[PDB]
Subunit: 188 residues, 3 copies
């Protein structure tokens, strides 16, 4: 079992189906960024402590979902042999219930917060912004190729999830959020 | 209060003013990368310990400044309703005094250093390179649209600040820097 | 000694040789991403503990090699004054022996694993995906300019190294890997 095949040494790689693409192709970038997010989520999960244990399981669940998302991003819409498997409905509602819960429990802001606080909250804000980077790449792909739009819906919602969870993480250790000092009242 | 509006589910988003852009638009990428840097800085700040407490306040200050920078990056130069608020002068001189101080105190190198050392120093080198990534995106934007050039000045200087602070962080725990073994004498 | 020259304040910068490029130029991005990887590796190394000490030296070695790689990426192929110095052969075989060893020792999977586990294993998966991001940028450069193809070979192999090392890191603390629940048997 050798994970190195050396077939990518010239800069091309296989997607799902028969097509090979350059490694910088917008599709390869899209699921590559999802993979980087997925690794970051694993890193974030590794920072869980006794105050923040309640977040551990859902972070693992998100990793499972990001594999499902990446699968579809790797799959051309006109590949006869492979189909999209990701359905946004249940995963996205699941995220929304957590955003709702976490928004309700934490102290309310009007103003932008500094992305920071505890190590876990800060890692969740990093997750938030990597998710947003991945989303930009998914949009890049979408503008050139037919994608499963369900992935974009979920990935969009997911960065709201990470924002909400980051604030929740601070709340779980009673670390106050800090406000952006020049912020207008932006959350309504 | 629902932070999820679902208006971005199709890949477009509002900037400051009335314009909507695709999420992968160079402007949205520019302030998105600034936001990722901002989250990283929060993460770096969360790693401060009793040896490195002297760096905590300025890292928070940098977060405030990155919100000011992102505001202007989000604002088209011909938006009648919104103006640039960021002025580079004082923030950049403030960075320069710290670069000066930190450069003076730490052991002098000629040669490239390995970006590493303590956890905080290493996080500061990560900050350095995320700042540089954000700067590249700001330049991408600048080549297509009129930006507040003050933001570029500050963001340029900021990666020098993170280099200097990373070396300072090592010095604060008396962790020696390691040299790149094939380095020419590059700092003069 | 002032590391800030202010010459890049307008968005252009020098490469090796006489050429100046915009900071978002594909070459500047390529070695800039290598620099971000290099900083991440330093961060990963800073997470080493008594269980994982055996990985510390090779991570430092990888930092040395990434400087060698970046040098060549910074060097145009037709620069009369500067030459490529990186040779892939020995560094890449060195990576392969470690991939082999680490693959052999850890429990075998068929299926995709969640990128996660201990803090160090998770950081190694982050390294894996930053390496892959850098590789995409190196390919972007290659499609426009003649590069030292040895760098691409090594950088390709390196993300396999980080995958193998991440699994090894889990094994060193006896943290089980978790499988992607919808994975097909992909490793053969
Ligand atoms: C898509 C894909 C991925 C995606 C998976 C999720 C996604 N879609 O975003 C991502 C980018 C995460 C991935 C990661 C890696 N994968 Co991959 N992946 C593939 C690919 C193209 C499809 C996998 C799949 O779902 N197969 C199942 C069905 C859909 O395919 P089928 O042809 O109908 O059967 C395959 C090639 C293949 N198997 O076709 C490799 C492939 C399985 N993966 C490979 C490798 C090496 C990796 C990585 C180790 C690369 C790395 N160094 O990071 C990691 C491991 C990740 C992990 N956590 O376990 C190799 C396996 C080599 C071997 N000896 O089996 C393959 C075979 C590609 C190759 N030939 O080089 N990859
Ligand atoms: C620019 C901007 C940002 C920037 C701010 C700094 C910068 N410029 O780089 C960044 C990218 C950091 C940002 C982040 C987020 N923001 Co925003 N932001 C905006 C935007 C477009 C302008 C905000 C502003 O300064 N308003 C003040 C003045 C200039 O605007 P005005 O019209 O004259 O009044 C607005 C939309 C708006 N308010 O116009 C949202 C908006 C306020 N933000 C929104 C959200 C959800 C977010 C995030 C939670 C997104 C996320 N999941 O990461 C985060 C929160 C960040 C934090 N730390 O608190 C939502 C708020 C939803 C609500 N119920 O109020 C808005 C309304 C956009 C939207 N309709 O979806 N965003
Ligand atoms: C390429 C390069 C880098 C690469 C090096 C590896 C690579 N190639 O990927 C990277 C991107 C890592 C780098 C990083 C930085 N470097 Co640089 N680098 C250069 C450059 C263009 C070549 C260096 C070199 O190898 N010289 C040796 C030979 C090949 O050049 P020669 O002309 O024949 O002599 C020079 C400019 C120069 N020296 O020509 C700067 C230069 C040496 N570096 C500079 C700086 C400031 C930096 C950083 C501090 C920037 C930052 N804030 O992150 C960091 C320090 C990194 C560290 N760990 O020590 C400045 C030094 C200023 C001074 N007072 O000496 C220079 C002179 C560029 C400039 N004029 O602004 N850079
Ligand atoms: N740099 C990269 N960024 C994102 N995705 C990649 C990258 N390289 C390959 N891929 C995708 O992820 C899968 C696994 O990567 P892998 O390294 O095995 O591919 P490869 O580089 O083509 O092969 P090899 O590394 O054996 O030469 C590939 O089949 C491809 O779909
Ligand atoms: N992926 C992204 N990367 C960077 N910036 C973004 C991204 N998506 C939106 N933005 C910018 O940041 C602000 C807040 O993001 P937000 O998620 O609220 O926007 P949206 O995705 O358009 O809306 P929603 O998530 O409610 O559907 C936006 O108004 C826009 O200026
Ligand atoms: N944002 C960036 N991303 C990646 N590489 C960069 C970036 N800016 C400069 N470089 C490269 O790295 C080297 C060091 O960066 P440095 O900040 O010293 O350059 P500069 O911005 O042109 O100068 P200064 O910061 O003094 O105005 C440069 O010579 C150039 O090769
Ligand atoms: K491989
Ligand atoms: K939102
Ligand atoms: K500089
Ligand atoms: Mg959104
Ligand atoms: Mg500079
Ligand atoms: Mg490969």
């Amino acid at each position: 079992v050798k994970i190195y095949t050396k077939n990518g040494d010239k800069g091309q790689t296989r997607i799902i189906g028969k097509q090979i693409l350059y490694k910088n192709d917008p599709r390869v970038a899209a699921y590559g960024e999802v993979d980087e997010l997925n690794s970051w989520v694993g890193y974030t999960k590794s920072l869980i402590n006794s105050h923040t244990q309640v977040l551990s399981n859902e972070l693992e669940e998100i990793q499972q979902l990001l594999f499902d998302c990446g699968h579809d991003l790797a799959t051309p819409a006109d590949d006869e042999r492979h189909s999209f498997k990701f359905k946004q409905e249940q995963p996205t509602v699941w995220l929304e219930e957590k955003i709702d819960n976490y928004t309700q429990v934490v102290p309310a802001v009007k103003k932008f917060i500094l992305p920071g606080g505890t190590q876990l909250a800060s890692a969740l804000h990093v997750a938030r912004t990597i998710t947003r980077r991945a989303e930009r790449q998914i949009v890049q792909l979408m503008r050139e190729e037919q994608i499963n739009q369900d992935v974009l819906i979920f990935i969009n919602r997911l960065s709201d999830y990470f924002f909400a969870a980051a604030r929740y993480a601070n709340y779980l250790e009673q670390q106050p959020d800090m406000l952006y000092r020049n912020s207008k009242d932006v959350f309504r």
